[PDB]
A paper describes a structure:
Acid sensing ion channels (ASICs) are voltage-insensitive and proton-gated members of the epithelial sodium channel/degenerin (ENaC/DEG) superfamily of ion channels that assemble as homo- or heterotrimeric sodium-selective ion channels and are expressed throughout vertebrate central and peripheral nervous systems. ASICs exhibit a simple three-state gating scheme, populating a non-conducting resting state at high pH, opening upon exposure to protons and quickly desensitizing, recovering proton-sensitivity only upon return to high pH. The homotrimeric splice variant ASIC1a is highly enriched in the central nervous system (CNS) and participates in numerous physiological processes including learning and memory and nociception. ASIC1a activity is modulated by endogenous divalent cations including Zn2+, Mg2+, and Ca2+ and the modification of ASIC1a gating by extracellular Ca2+ has been an area of active investigation.
In an effort to unambiguously assign binding sites for divalent cations on the resting channel structure, Δ25 crystals grown at high pH were soaked in Ba2+, whose effect on ASIC1a channels mimics that of Ca2+. Crystals of resting Δ25 channels belong to the P212121 space group and were obtained at high pH and in the presence of Ba2+. Inspection of anomalous difference electron density maps subjected to real space threefold averaging revealed nine Ba2+ sites within the acidic pocket and the central vestibule, in general agreement with electron density maps from the Δ25-Ca2+ x-ray structure. However, given the resolution limitations we are unable to define the protein atoms directly coordinating the Ba2+ ions and we therefore simply describe the protein residues that surround the ion sites. The acidic pocket, an electrostatically negative cavern which harbors binding sites for toxins and putative proton sites, and undergoes a large conformational change during channel activation, contains two anomalous difference peaks for Ba2+ on the resting channel at high pH. Despite this limitation, the position of the 9 σ anomalous difference peak deep within the acidic pocket suggests possible coordination of Ba2+ by acidic residues Glu 98 and Glu 239 of the channel’s finger domain. The weaker, 6 σ Ba2+ peak is situated at a subunit-subunit interface within the acidic pocket near highly conserved residues Glu 243 of the finger domain and both Glu 220 and Asp 408 from the palm domain of a neighboring subunit. The central vestibule, buried within the channel core and situated along the threefold axis of resting ASIC1a channels, harbors a trio of threefold symmetric 8 σ anomalous difference peaks for Ba2+. These Ba2+ ions are situated at the nexus of upper and lower palm domains ~ 5 Å from Glu 412, Glu 417, Glu 374 and Gln 277 residues and immediately off of β11-β12 linkers.
Residue numbers in the entry:
A (entry chain B): 42 to 459
B (entry chain A): 42 to 458
C (entry chain C): 42 to 148, 153 to 459
Write the structure that this text describes.
Amino acid sequence: LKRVVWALCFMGSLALLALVCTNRIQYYFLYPHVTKLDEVAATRLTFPAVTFCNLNEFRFSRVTKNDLYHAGELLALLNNRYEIPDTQTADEKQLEILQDKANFRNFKPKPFNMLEFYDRAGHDIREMLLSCFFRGEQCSPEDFKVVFTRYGKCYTFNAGQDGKPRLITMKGGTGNGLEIMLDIQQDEYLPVWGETDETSFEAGIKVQIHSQDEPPLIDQLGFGVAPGFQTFVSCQEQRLIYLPPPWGDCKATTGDSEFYDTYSITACRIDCETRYLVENCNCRMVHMPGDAPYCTPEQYKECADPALDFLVEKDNEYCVCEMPCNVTRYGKELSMVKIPSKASAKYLAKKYNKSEQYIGENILVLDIFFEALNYETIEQKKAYEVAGLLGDIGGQMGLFIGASILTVLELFDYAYEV
Amino acid sequence: LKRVVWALCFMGSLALLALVCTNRIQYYFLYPHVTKLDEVAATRLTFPAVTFCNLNEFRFSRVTKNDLYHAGELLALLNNRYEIPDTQTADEKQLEILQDKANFRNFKPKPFNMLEFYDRAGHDIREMLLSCFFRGEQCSPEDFKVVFTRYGKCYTFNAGQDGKPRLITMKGGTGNGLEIMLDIQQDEYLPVWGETDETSFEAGIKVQIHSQDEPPLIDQLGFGVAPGFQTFVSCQEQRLIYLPPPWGDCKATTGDSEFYDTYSITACRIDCETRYLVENCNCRMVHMPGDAPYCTPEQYKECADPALDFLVEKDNEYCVCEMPCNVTRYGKELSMVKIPSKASAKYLAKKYNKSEQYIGENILVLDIFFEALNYETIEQKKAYEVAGLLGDIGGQMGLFIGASILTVLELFDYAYE
Amino acid sequence: LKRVVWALCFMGSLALLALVCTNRIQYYFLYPHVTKLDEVAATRLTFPAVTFCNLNEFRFSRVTKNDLYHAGELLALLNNRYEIPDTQTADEKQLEILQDKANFRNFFNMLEFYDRAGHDIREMLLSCFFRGEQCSPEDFKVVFTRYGKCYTFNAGQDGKPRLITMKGGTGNGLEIMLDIQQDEYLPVWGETDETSFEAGIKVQIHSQDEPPLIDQLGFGVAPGFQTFVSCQEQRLIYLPPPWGDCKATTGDSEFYDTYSITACRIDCETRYLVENCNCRMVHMPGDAPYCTPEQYKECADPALDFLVEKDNEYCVCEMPCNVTRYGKELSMVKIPSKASAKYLAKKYNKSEQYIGENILVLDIFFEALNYETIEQKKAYEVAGLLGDIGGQMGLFIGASILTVLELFDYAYEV
Ligand SMILES: *[C@@H]1O[C@H](CO)[C@@H](O[C@@H]2O[C@H](CO)[C@@H](O)[C@H](O)[C@H]2NC(C)=O)[C@H](O)[C@H]1NC(C)=O
Ligand SMILES: *[C@@H]1O[C@H](CO)[C@@H](O)[C@H](O)[C@H]1NC(C)=O
Ligand SMILES: *[C@@H]1O[C@H](CO)[C@@H](O)[C@H](O)[C@H]1NC(C)=O
Ligand SMILES: *[C@@H]1O[C@H](CO)[C@@H](O)[C@H](O)[C@H]1NC(C)=O
Ligand SMILES: *[C@@H]1O[C@H](CO)[C@@H](O)[C@H](O)[C@H]1NC(C)=O
Ligand SMILES: [Ba+2]
Ligand SMILES: [Cl-]
Ligand SMILES: [Cl-]
Ligand SMILES: [Cl-]
């Protein structure tokens, strides 16, 4: 009778060992991870890269007759027949100027390049930048690097490219960061006389705070800043460490692109777009990097734009961009105050030779800074390693039947002898 | 002497095994969890449901003499004695309209319904919606579905109700989302001539971005949008998975509500309120769902409001809403640009046959989109499961005394003799 | 041949046990932790303390001739030679007043000057409501910061009970209508260090256990808008060494009852200024002597700036293990509505323009009646290590602690 109770106890114990062991094994092959959040104080923080664009792509006073000829349809200033659209709400002077530039009688077309057009007709930072301050000391427009995006000629402060060393901040708070007073030059905006898809009613700038290791993607990752306010941006540096397969989904390999030195998801997207447009239309857009020839406005109309839209719509499988394992993100909180005060309106108007109306509707102040001298870390950590797996299997294997790998080897010994 | 040192080693080993084993047992019985954060790229994102209200509950030009008679005191247009309050700083015409509407001389009242009054007097989406675009293609006011909230007649885009399929976005950024130009119609706002508790000075709209599975709760979960700016709202889809008892506190059961098909904490809140008001006052407010009769303004005055206030403090234990285990939340970052530009102000003024002053104080553009085509996941994960407990107990049990469950069974066997 | 493969299996098995066991040993000695996020529903939430300053340090109408004499250079209204700045863009009345106050023919405490000349909450506070019930200016406690005379609602200091809210949403919180008094702003005729073009207020939402640090931790609120602030209470629990970096011993400073990272920062600053200049600035607390405007120019400011740059290691403030933080999301609506501008203008005896350029409404509340908890939790405890080493020790060679002791005996005998 005792051998029966022993047989039942050994059988049930071996069954429990079976299901528990297969449980821990399956849990290991899920490759599970859990997250470790930490806050690290630092004596210094590397200030990020700040890219800003004017919402107006190009200045009206800088557009020329040749520009209307080649890119008149693309710039939406002229209709398909090289004639001005509906004149509703058209200033007499502006409409006469445009009508004069669109005469096109005995006109010899000069050579035209999209990057030349954006570079000269775009808003000059030397005119927009009314004042610059970093850590309380003056900055020059030479700190701003020209970057071409979908919005046109844009500028990146502290880009850290072309061998310039990146700036640091040793104190947090509103004073100890970037602080620029900009004039968005609303007088230079393209007149809107007729409704169009490209017609926009916004006035202000668009800013993206990003690491120097990634290029700007201002059309998607930027936030707007409106004239007439001083906007504060409190930043919190975040350092992210992800896990590669089979734990998570990250880009383990450096994967350097021909266009960009360091791999970033932004660089992967704009690289994918660049390759697609170069293959499909044999030309490259203004914002894209490389050595390819830039598109002509005819190529823009008949190939480039429908090609990108078709790439977005047809299938995401062509452009699948994984996230790198080491990522520096910047968190940001926005707040506003009014500019200028009644005590300063006259002084600003006289300082920049403008009317107080103009100052009120054209001046914005951007204040970008770190809230405090610390950074957060978010790390994906492996939850079950092979040492822990063997430890649990050994513990339960020793608890239920008290056997070992040598014991199973001995049972296989008798099986081979049998 | 050797058996004595052996006895000391076995005793100390058995004590240590005792305290370590009870340690792992207690840690298991705390039922602990830890969190798994992950970010997932996606080729498509389901666009959320967007509900907005005008801050002005009902239009002044649509209020009628009968409305003043029944709900004049409730709307704060008339005083306790059904008379207009002080006319201080009242436009002559503006007051003339109200004085004529509140005559009540030889007036034979007609039936009155609160939901009819809000549905007819509230701001019409056909007049507010100056332009609508979703993913660059035009939308109609018919895309917005009417929901009645505490703020009055409100509208939900991509509500996904009545069999409509939920919309998706295949690109991120400002262009590729919902983008509406609204006229908040500040001329239709209730005149404020005298101080009252209900008096408010704000002008604009209130928006809540929420999953289609939940009803809006704009009085608590909404954010404001001011006229004269294009407000960008960058959304981040977050997918949350919680643990039921005994690990955490989540809804293990489906939790069928009578009013709503899907369970949500909001649906639980307005369910608690609706049930409480039906039991105490036998009527429901406009925002509440169901089939009960709507309250009359007298019922509102003498029963509903004090009942809700008594519900907040006295019965704070009475309404307990557990959180569901699988929840889709949307995070948001707001930024603004100025509207309109000087190059467009007059074109807007002529396009909508308004003065530039009006455009300046009445037009707002709302741009709701996903920052990028990805979603975050926040999961509560069990930290100590029974397999790990048995493995650790077996490991320490085998390290300290080298025993097994069969060893203790044999010890009970020898003890049996 | 069988004993040879048995011996090799025991050798290799002991090697595997060695590397796995040392693996768990080293992993345990990393002292790792992982994060536990949780959301806790509550019937009540303790409302935070809200400190706000006007961006304008002191009122122009309250400055007197003596104040111009002593602190004229510091306040930037007068130059080093006690003369008026450039007369470009100067109000005729303001310039006549300043020249009159600067007559300096036949003609001071910093805290008296800030306390009396600063913006009075009794004039700024046009309306106050908390949970729908009226509040008085006496509920705000005066705190002196770098911005000047500032005010803290629900400060909870001096034994006052902390306020609670039993409902979430815009109505059920603090709601104040303020007049920033833009007419009292210092006239700016020439460039100066204090010169600012902003108009509005600065707010910091913080727990009562920590002092305000509004020049660094504050956000702006612009006039002409009602800004809503949705708050989410967060409770953070950190680990002390060797797991993390937290202050296990509170080691509260004499200046403040409860230890906070901010309180440690301003304590270090006060101590440094007392050591180098034998005086304390306006914002600093204690019983120490306040600086004179001459002391400010030649000692205080360069000492503070040099303290930030020269020795950043000197002030090391550890983070406490239990920290209550408040998350916040801002949004705006326009104030006043066209239907309400006239009533406000007449109610407060101001022009409709003045209301447009001076009135702001602040609405601070909890989004919902819950709070988040973020806890650092130990990933490998000594019981788990002994369990893993025991499991692998029993799987690979099947030995025990008693087995190793017996091996020491048999080795000792032979
Ligand atoms: C990602 O960041 C980690 C640190 O956060 C890097 O790990 C360091 O790698 C260097 C080798 O170049 C070592 O000298 C350091 O000791 C490592 N630090 C730690 C904490 O392990 C890692 O190399 C980075 N990965 C990439 C691809 O850049
Ligand atoms: C200010 O600008 C106007 C615009 O052309 C110009 O005529 C005037 O001379 C300028 N004044 C000064 C002082 O430069
Ligand atoms: C435009 O509005 C005015 C009143 O403001 C009205 O008289 C006129 O008929 C309107 N025109 C159109 C085309 O609606
Ligand atoms: C810290 O806060 C937690 C709740 O978040 C509480 O349980 C604990 O008692 C507090 N004190 C310590 C020393 O952890
Ligand atoms: C109202 O404002 C005027 C203009 O400054 C002032 O003279 C008058 O005294 C004010 N009324 C009161 C009651 O303060
Ligand atoms: Ba009752
Ligand atoms: Cl997992
Ligand atoms: Cl727990
Ligand atoms: Cl670790």
